[PDB]
Amino acid sequence: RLKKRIFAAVSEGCVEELRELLQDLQDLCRRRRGLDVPDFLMHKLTASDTGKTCLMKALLNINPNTKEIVRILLAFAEENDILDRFINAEYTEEAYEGQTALNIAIERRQGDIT
């Protein structure tokens, strides 16, 4: 229920709406048994079917305010220290195996995000 709200908020360009949803993720991260919370937070930001992360969902849908959405998402993974796993995820299907985030930013001709 929360995972689908983030994919809609990032594709459309909902800047203010994005922030409380990540805060609601921080609300669910203070409370847990607390065993595998770095692996848990990757489970909420990655579609389990293919491996598409919400950073990959941002760059496929270019908005006039897509520069700031990437700046928010890189700040969030820094604070919880899954930054290398989050910026280097891949697709897992046969048709797209190995495609990364900056492999999308080059094809969308985004010089400054890259």
Binding site: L60, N61, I62, A95, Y96, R108, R109, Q110
Partner: protein, 64 residues
């Protein structure tokens, strides 16, 4: 033009259930509640460079 007149006369004589079997096109969800039975053509362009907005599908493969 002379071969095109031959094709449309062979089509008028074959029966109705054959016309459903040899039908071109495919239903596509174009917009909100809009299905139009469209035809697909591929291209390659090396001059016009632009970032791509207003696609229908995000995943650019031949799905299934």
């Amino acid at each position: 033009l002379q071969r095109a007149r031959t094709i449309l006369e062979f089509e008028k004589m074959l029966p109705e259930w054959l016309r459903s079997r040899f039908r071109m096109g495919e239903l596509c969800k174009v917009a909100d509640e809009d299905f139009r039975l469209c035809l697909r053509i591929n291209e390659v362009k090396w001059t016009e460079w632009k970032t791509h907005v207003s696609f229908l599908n995000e995943d650019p493969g031949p799905i299934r």
